[PDB]
Amino acid sequence: MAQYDVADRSAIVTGGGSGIGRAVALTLAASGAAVLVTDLNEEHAQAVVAEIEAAGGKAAALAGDVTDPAFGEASVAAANALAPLKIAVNNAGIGGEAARVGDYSLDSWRKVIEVNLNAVFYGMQPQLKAMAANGGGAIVNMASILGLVGFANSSAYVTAKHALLGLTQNAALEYAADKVRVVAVGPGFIRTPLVEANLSAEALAFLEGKHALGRLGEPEEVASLVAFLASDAASFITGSYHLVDGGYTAQ
Amino acid sequence: MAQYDVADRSAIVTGGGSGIGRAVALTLAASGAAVLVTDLNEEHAQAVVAEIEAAGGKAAALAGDVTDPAFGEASVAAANALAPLKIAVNNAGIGGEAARVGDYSLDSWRKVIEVNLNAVFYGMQPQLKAMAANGGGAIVNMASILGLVGFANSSAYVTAKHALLGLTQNAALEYAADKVRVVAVGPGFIRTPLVEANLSAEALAFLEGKHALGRLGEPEEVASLVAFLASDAASFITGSYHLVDGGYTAQ
Amino acid sequence: MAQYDVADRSAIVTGGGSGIGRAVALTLAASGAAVLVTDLNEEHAQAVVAEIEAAGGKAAALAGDVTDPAFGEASVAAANALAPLKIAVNNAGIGGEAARVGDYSLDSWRKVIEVNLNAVFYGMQPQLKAMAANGGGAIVNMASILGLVGFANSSAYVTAKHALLGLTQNAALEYAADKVRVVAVGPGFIRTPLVEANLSAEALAFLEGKHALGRLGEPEEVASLVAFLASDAASFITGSYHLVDGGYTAQ
Amino acid sequence: MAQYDVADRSAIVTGGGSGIGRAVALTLAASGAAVLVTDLNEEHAQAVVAEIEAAGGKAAALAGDVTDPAFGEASVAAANALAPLKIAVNNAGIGGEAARVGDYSLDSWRKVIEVNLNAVFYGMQPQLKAMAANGGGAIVNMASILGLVGFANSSAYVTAKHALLGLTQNAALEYAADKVRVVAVGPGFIRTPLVEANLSAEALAFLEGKHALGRLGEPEEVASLVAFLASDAASFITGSYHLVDGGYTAQ
Ligand SMILES: NC(=O)c1ccc[n+]([C@@H]2O[C@H](COP(=O)([O-])OP(=O)(O)OC[C@H]3O[C@@H](n4cnc5c(N)ncnc54)[C@H](O)[C@@H]3O)[C@@H](O)[C@H]2O)c1
Ligand SMILES: NC(=O)c1ccc[n+]([C@@H]2O[C@H](COP(=O)([O-])OP(=O)(O)OC[C@H]3O[C@@H](n4cnc5c(N)ncnc54)[C@H](O)[C@@H]3O)[C@@H](O)[C@H]2O)c1
Ligand SMILES: NC(=O)c1ccc[n+]([C@@H]2O[C@H](COP(=O)([O-])OP(=O)(O)OC[C@H]3O[C@@H](n4cnc5c(N)ncnc54)[C@H](O)[C@@H]3O)[C@@H](O)[C@H]2O)c1
Ligand SMILES: NC(=O)c1ccc[n+]([C@@H]2O[C@H](COP(=O)([O-])OP(=O)(O)OC[C@H]3O[C@@H](n4cnc5c(N)ncnc54)[C@H](O)[C@@H]3O)[C@@H](O)[C@H]2O)c1
Ligand SMILES: [Zn+2]
Ligand SMILES: [Zn+2]
Ligand SMILES: [Zn+2]
Ligand SMILES: [Zn+2]
Ligand SMILES: [Zn+2]
Ligand SMILES: [Zn+2]
Ligand SMILES: [Zn+2]
Ligand SMILES: [Zn+2]
Ligand SMILES: [Zn+2]
Ligand SMILES: [Zn+2]
Known part of the structure; x- marks a missing residue:
């Protein structure tokens, strides 16, 4: 019977057509949030919207690429048009080339920074300004x-993730006075069916060995934290x- | 309308007679948890059980000293009477003398360690075993x-809270395979009646400036995070x- | 009167003509390191080389841009030509636009990332393979x-510098087998010529008040750590x- | 040919008789430091002074228990007599028992904390006062x-070492004005001869795998960083x- 004060507000969930983003959207909607589910995949974004509507929640699907700053502008205006934008979950991420630092391809490195870091930046610009004007x-x-x-052969990914904590801090410092809070969530390895269906039974069992709890996390387990941090409960x-x-x- | 997955179990809140402990017990009870408010101060701890009971909640008081390992054995029994124990908040803590390391009294150092670190460990011992026994x-x-x-002139205090992260880390590693989670919560300067009663307007301002949000935090704001990480929703x-x-x- | 085990080997030092990278190159070459001083400003790299050679040290200038991957291929080759490349200090960096995350120029964000993160990655690629090659x-x-x-209004910079910690971690893990150590150094505010030149005395004062020691650092004080870490002493x-x-x- | 600017003053190295304390004494002394080995083993402390005078340096033993605040007072007097005290390595540490948190011996916990943390504190009080007077x-x-x-089954130790970073931070803040620097070193697993002695082949192989470099650290490698951070070269x-x-x- 978990419920979070996330009502009477619109909430953007980028990369919300699958995995952890899906778990976020569903959870946020199911506490009364007007969820704008954005994704490169129009059809997945709709497939989720349909569950939230079917569950009894408001939700809408914008399809697009978060690397397009204009698309970030157009997700904030679409969200604001459901309810005031008071939640943004910059979740959309790719995993990148599996290679060593000296062998990593300059296009593959750049892509992983563009998506996993710069797109979060582009997305945050019109999220901060919207939330800031409409009271927090x-x-x-x-x-x-x-x-x-670290993790070997995923330097760009490792690097992007690390970058986010600094952008998170800075946005938080700069917009605290505007009562816009900015936090970062840090999952261990989650069984996003990409993971499940990409990994061998031998590989799965190895990663499982890395976590004290002895399993991989579930999406719903990340979503629950995200929803709490996105709520009025996490006001400090x-x-x-x-x-x-x-x-x-x-x- | 915030509600946490803590029903059908007992929660020990040490130093739960006052402040953040009192906010925590209140908030945990309100979501169905059976709260054992433990405090030095038997009457404070009673006063708190009444608010729980006058709000429809379930709770009992036990007065004792967390520095006595026995009292920690006795707290776990008392909780396990109410319901199977599955939450414990080691919240009880004290300020210690206002001085520089080189001018610190060997008693005030030893005292602040004993209460703010050792007593947390003493309570954990039975807390863990009892949680492991009853499946986590x-x-x-x-x-x-x-x-x-750091904070200047509060060495003993800072040392003890640093320590707690290690203890937290070891306990978590060692009891993962028992589904017993262990975490730590880092508040900023919280607006408790003792802090409100102690601070000059000038000193109060100074601390406010140190927080990006431009204020001290409220107890209920710590209470919420604690309730969440104590809940089934935080299972990873x-x-x-x-x-x-x-x-x-x-x- | 400090000396460092950095002899019988070559040492790249990006951003070499100015402030901190200059001090590095001096300190390294004064312990017998063959220093390639690389920099946008040919004539600034030349003026450092001369100071080295004047003190007795073996040094070469190689002006260019680290945002060109070619220029890190070339910087390595020209290092190996003095002595085996066994040291590389990716020091070259820029500060970027003083503006809030919401108002931040995209040009400036991508230009601050490119120099401070991506160029470190481009220049580390041949560095890693080259040092791996001369057996560590x-x-x-x-x-x-x-x-x-964080520091507010310098978001891109902060984001960049945060990133390096991941890349550094990942490089280390990936090339530990080949005896190539990777490490980050984190200076506080240093009184480089350009910092002394652009800060107003009011600004300078305010910053000194955020450092315990009550002053800004000196470049001499960053180069010593750099030298030590780049030596055989820091082997673990x-x-x-x-x-x-x-x-x-x-x- | 590594040397450190640690001359024209006395050092304390507590536990200076064996392992990482002994390597530290040897390294410091060689660069012109006047070492005061302080240790429990009367003999071992002396045998290290002997190695120090044999290589040509200056050194004195003083056999005692750091857990005795007076012995800290006496150690500092002894150092101030050789030369003005401007180094203190609180190196002296013990393991404690190999048990879970819930089963852990209350005296073994109290013992570990007492030495690893409180003794470092007890010792620091005269260390700090003496260094402030004699100019840093x-x-x-x-x-x-x-x-x-964390490390499973060594919870008291992990706790004690975590605590040190808080004490280290606080001291550092409080006496930065008096030019007393306070730092902490974090070695990994170090194959000191006592550790060479207590590990099975199976257990040593297991630890080596946990380290990216695929071997345990040597005590000389820890000795070098300690020496640097203790030196005038580390003045920021x-x-x-x-x-x-x-x-x-x-x-
Ligand atoms: N083990 C894990 O799965 C794990 C752990 C930690 C963090 N994360 C992070 O969680 C987030 C989601 O991961 P996941 O495992 O659920 O991924 P997923 O592959 O299951 O889903 C991610 C979605 O992002 C979308 N997307 C990709 N690039 C996009 C772009 N440029 N514009 C718009 N949408 C785009 C895709 O359509 C996809 O449906 C990512 O940021 C990832 O880095 C994942
Ligand atoms: N600024 C803040 O208030 C702040 C910020 C961060 C963390 N904390 C931590 O939160 C905890 C609670 O602090 P608070 O601000 O609510 O203080 P508080 O004094 O208002 O509440 C603490 C309660 O603990 C009890 N207690 C103290 N020592 C005890 C002992 N040995 N045995 C049993 N009960 C004992 C007291 O009787 C008191 O009722 C402490 O650990 C404190 O360090 C507080
Ligand atoms: N307060 C400080 O000065 C301070 C403190 C912490 C970190 N840092 C970091 O230290 C490093 C050096 O900064 P600094 O203070 O010495 O500044 P600086 O401007 O004095 O030195 C930077 C040098 O890099 C060169 N350079 C810039 N972009 C280049 C490029 N693309 N290719 C080649 N050369 C290029 C510049 O011409 C200059 O010689 C940077 O990474 C900076 O972020 C500086
Ligand atoms: N694997 C490692 O060796 C390792 C790794 C990281 C940290 N450390 C830390 O490094 C420090 C030195 O440990 P070591 O590896 O040299 O161990 P060690 O046991 O070989 O040396 C510790 C020394 O301290 C002395 N000592 C112990 N209690 C004392 C007391 N009360 N008063 C005075 N002297 C006392 C002992 O006689 C001994 O010579 C400790 O603080 C330890 O926890 C050890
Ligand atoms: Zn389509
Ligand atoms: Zn599909
Ligand atoms: Zn780790
Ligand atoms: Zn499954
Ligand atoms: Zn800070
Ligand atoms: Zn109030
Ligand atoms: Zn030129
Ligand atoms: Zn010029
Ligand atoms: Zn100057
Ligand atoms: Zn050996």
Whole structure:
């Protein structure tokens, strides 16, 4: 019977057509949030919107690329047109080329920075200004355990994640006075069916060994934290990093 | 309309007679938890159980000293009477003398360690075993911003809150496989009646400037995070540190 | 009267003609390091080389832009031509537009990222492979206290410097087997010529008041740490972040 | 040919008789420091002074228990007699029992805390006062990787070392005005001869795998960083925690 004060407000969830973003959208809607579900995938974004409408919640699907600053502008105006924008979850992420730092391809590095960092930046610009004018809010940026620690062959990913904590802090420092809070969430390895369906049974069991809890997290487990940080309950929580990693980074 | 997944179990709130402890007990009871308010101050702890009971909640008081390991054994029994124990908040803490390391009294150092660190460990011992026995749960150790950063003339206090992150980290690693989660919460300067009663207007301002949000935090604001990480919704969050600091440590 | 085990090997130092990168190159070459001083400003790189050679040290200038991957291929080759490349200090950086996250120029954001992060990555690529090749070495990345904590209106910079900590961690993990150590250094505010030149005395004062020591650092004071980490003495130090901030991030 | 600007003054190295304390004494002395080995083992402390005078340096033993505040007072008198005290390494530490938090021996916990933390504090009080009067100095506090991250079954230790970073921060803030620097070192697992002696082949192989460099640290490698941070070359470094771990904490 978990419910969060996220009503009477619109909420953007970028990359919300699948996995953790989906879990976020559904959870936020199911506490009364007007959820603008944005994604490169028009059809997934609609497929989610349909569940939220079917569950009894308001939700709308903008399709687009977060690397387009204009698309960030157009997700804020679409959200504001459901309810005042008072929530943004910059979740949309790709995993990138699997290569060492000396072998990493300059286009693949640049792509991973563009999406996992710069698109969060482009998205935040019209989120901060909207929330700031309409009296306050909460931006949740989707980082990782790998915004704190390393993992071999995922340098660009590791690097992007790490960058987010600094942009999170700075946005939080700058817009605290406008009562717009900015936090970062830091999951351990989550069973997003991309992961499940990409990994061998041997590989899955290895990562499982990295986390003290002895499993991978579920999307719903990240969403619950995101929803809490996005709520009025977390009114004193800004600029900070929050792990959901079943004890990965504790050793 | 915030509500947390803590029903059908007992919660020990140490130093729950007053301040953030009192906010926590209130907030935990209100969502269905059976709260054992433990305090030195038997009557404070009673006063709090009444508000719970006059709000429809369930709760009992136990007066004792967390510095006595026995009292921590006795707190777990008393809680497990009410319902199976699955939450414990080690919240009880004290200020200690206002001095520089080189001028610190060997008693005030030893005292602040004993209460603010050792007593947290003493309570944890039975807390863990009892939670493991009954298939798992959640321990939230009340730390601070000052378990991460310094404050001048509060060495003993800062040292103790730093310590708590390690204890938290080890306990989480060691009892993951028992589904017993352990986390720590770092508030910024909270507006308790003792802080309101102690601070000059000038000193109060100075601390406000140090927080990005441009105010001290309210107890209910710490209470909310604690209730969430104590809840089933936080089932993948363990060993981690969680700030509720209004952007104090983001600069 | 300090000396460093940095002899019989070549040492790239990006941003070499000015402030901190200059001090690095001096300190390294004064312990017998063959210093390639690389920089946009040919004639600034030349003026440092001369100071080295004048003190007895072996140094070469190679003016260009680190935002060209070609110019890190070339910088390495021209280092290997003096002595085996066993040291690289990715020090070159820029500050970017003084503006809020919401108002931040996209041009300036991408230009601050490019120099401070991507160029570090482009120049680390051949560095890593080159040092791996001459049976080991050490890369030092010039981050900041602002890879740890925020400073408002410098979001891009802060974001960039935060990123380096991940890249650094990932490089280290990935090339530890090949005995190539990677480490970040985090200075606080340093009185470079350009910092002394553009700060007003009022600004300068305010900053000194945020550092415990009550002054800004000197470049001499950053180069020593850089030199030590880049030496054979720091043989068991890889992947870690080392603050030279006069107590700035301790509060 | 590494040398450190640690001359024209006395150093305290507590635990200076064996392992990382012994390596520290040897390294400091060689660069013109007048070392006061202080240790429990009367003999071992003397055998280290002998190695120091044999290589040509200046050194004195003083056998005692750091847990005795008076012995700190006496150690500092002894140092101030050799030369004005401007180094203090609080190196002296013990393991405690290998048990879970819930089963952990209450005296073994209290013992560990007493030495690893409180003794460092007891010792610091006269260290700090003496260094402020005689125009500044440095205090290196020996922490560990286990001051940041957990290790299963060593909870009292992990706790004690975490605590050191708080004490280290606070001291640093309070006496920065008096030019007393306070830092912490975090070694990874170090194959000191006592550790060479107590590990099975199976257990040593397990720890080596946890370190990116794929071997345990040598005590000379920890000795070098301690020496640097203690030196005039580190004059803008205070309040900070310096890992020498072999990439242990970078994953
Ligand atoms: N183990 C994990 O899965 C894990 C752990 C930590 C953090 N994360 C982060 O969580 C977020 C979501 O991860 P996930 O595992 O749920 O991913 P996913 O692959 O399941 O879904 C991500 C969605 O992002 C969308 N997307 C990609 N690029 C886009 C772009 N340029 N514009 C718009 N939409 C775009 C895709 O359509 C996709 O549906 C990412 O930021 C990821 O980095 C994932
Ligand atoms: N500024 C703040 O108020 C602030 C900020 C961050 C963290 N905290 C932490 O929150 C916790 C609660 O602090 P607060 O501000 O609500 O203070 P408080 O004094 O208002 O409440 C603390 C309660 O703990 C009890 N207590 C103290 N020592 C005890 C002992 N040995 N045995 C049993 N009960 C004992 C007291 O009787 C008191 O009722 C402490 O750990 C404190 O350090 C407080
Ligand atoms: N307060 C400070 O000065 C301070 C403190 C912390 C960190 N840092 C970092 O230290 C490094 C040096 O900064 P600084 O203070 O010495 O500044 P600086 O301007 O004095 O030195 C930077 C040098 O890099 C050169 N440069 C810039 N872009 C380049 C490019 N694309 N290719 C080649 N050369 C280029 C400049 O011409 C200059 O010689 C940077 O990474 C900076 O962020 C500086
Ligand atoms: N693997 C490692 O060796 C390692 C890694 C990281 C941190 N550390 C820390 O490094 C420090 C030195 O440990 P070590 O590896 O040299 O261990 P060690 O046991 O070889 O040396 C510790 C020394 O301290 C002395 N000592 C102990 N209690 C004392 C007391 N009360 N008063 C005076 N002297 C006392 C002992 O006689 C001994 O010579 C400790 O603080 C330890 O926790 C050790
Ligand atoms: Zn389509
Ligand atoms: Zn599909
Ligand atoms: Zn499944
Ligand atoms: Zn109030
Ligand atoms: Zn700070
Ligand atoms: Zn030119
Ligand atoms: Zn010029
Ligand atoms: Zn000057
Ligand atoms: Zn050996
Ligand atoms: Zn780790």
